[PDB]
Design an enzyme around this catalytic site. Structure first.
Site: not given
Ligand SMILES: [Ca+2]
Length: 223
Positions: A40, A52, A54, A57, A62, A84, A171-172, A174-175, A177-178
Site C-alpha cells: 500500500h 537516516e 533526522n 537534515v 545517508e 501487503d 502503537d505504530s 500513519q507514516g 507503514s512499510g
Molecule cells: Ca538525514
C-alpha cells in the site's frame, strides 16, 4: 510511532525512508540491492534513503538511491490489505557498514509473546498530529491469533498478525507503514494497518513476513 522512544541515530541500520519529495513510508533493507516495504506504499518516483536519522537534515551517513524496479506482491488486495508486501530494487547497491545494514529474513515464523522492535517516522499522536524528524522506536509483543481476530472480526488473514498493547497508548501509525517489525534479529513483520493508532482494543496489524520468504528469495534471484 505513538508512545515510543527516540531510537538513537543509526541504531536501526536496516530502516529506510521512502521519499517522493518527502518521507511517505518506511522499508527494510534486506540486502545491498533490495528493500521490503508495504504494497500500500507503492508509487512511482521512489528514492530510497538509507542511513537516516533526522529526515530533514543531512547528517553524514545517508545514502540516497533511486528505485529501478518495484514489485507489488502478485496477490496484493488493496481493499483487504491481504498480502501487503512489495519489493524495491535499488539502481545501485548500497555500501553496507555499521549504520547501513541488511536485516535477516526469518527461517521460521514468530510466536505470540515474542518482543519485537517497531520503528518509523510516522505520527506520534493518537488524538493529534505530530511528525518527528528523528527515528522513533517501540518495543512490543506479538499478540495471539485469537486476540488479534477478536480485536478485528472478519479481517485478519493468515498473512497478518497483531502486535502491541490492547490497553492503548503504544502503537505504530500513519507514516510508519512499510517499516520493520524485528524480533530476535529477524524481520517478522511490516507495518500495515490498524483502526486509528494506539486505540484501546485496536492493536497494530502487520504483514506476516515468514509467509513470503520463498517469494522474496525467488524474486531476488530472477530480478
Ligand atoms: Ca538525514
Amino acid at each position: 510511532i505513538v508512545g515510543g522512544y527516540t531510537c538513537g541515530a543509526n541504531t536501526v541500520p536496516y530502516q529506510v525512508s521512502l521519499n517522493s519529495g518527502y518521507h511517505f513510508c518506511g522499508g527494510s533493507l534486506i540486502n545491498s540491492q533490495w528493500v521490503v516495504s508495504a504494497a500500500h506504499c507503492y508509487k512511482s518516483g521512489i528514492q530510497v534513503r538509507l542511513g537516516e536519522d533526522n529526515i530533514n537534515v543531512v547528517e553524514g551517513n545517508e545514502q540516497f538511491i533511486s528505485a529501478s524496479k518495484s514489485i507489488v506482491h502478485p496477490s496484493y488486495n488493496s481493499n483487504t490489505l491481504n498480502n501487503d508486501i512489495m519489493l524495491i530494487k535499488l539502481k545501485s547497491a548500497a555500501s553496507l557498514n555499521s549504520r547501513v545494514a541488511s536485516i535477516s529474513l526469518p527461517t521460521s515464523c514468530a510466536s505470540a509473546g515474542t518482543q519485537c522492535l517497531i520503528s518509523g517516522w510516522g505520527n506520534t499522536k493518537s488524538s493529534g498530529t505530530s511528525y518527528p524528524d528523528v527515528l522513533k522506536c517501540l518495543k512490543a509483543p506479538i499478540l495471539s491469533d485469537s486476540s488479534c481476530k477478536s480485536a478485528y472480526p472478519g479481517q485478519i488473514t493468515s498473512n497478518m498478525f497483531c502486535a502491541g498493547y490492547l490497553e492503548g497508548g503504544k502503537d505504530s501509525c500513519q507514516g510508519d507503514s512499510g517499516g520493520p517489525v524485528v524480533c530476535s534479529g529477524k524481520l517478522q513483520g511490516i507495518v500495515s494497518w490498524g483502526s486509528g493508532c494506539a486505540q484501546k482494543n485496536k492493536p497494530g496489524v502487520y504483514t506476516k513476513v515468514c509467509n513470503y520468504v520463498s517469494w522474496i528469495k525467488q524474486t531476488i534471484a530472477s530480478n
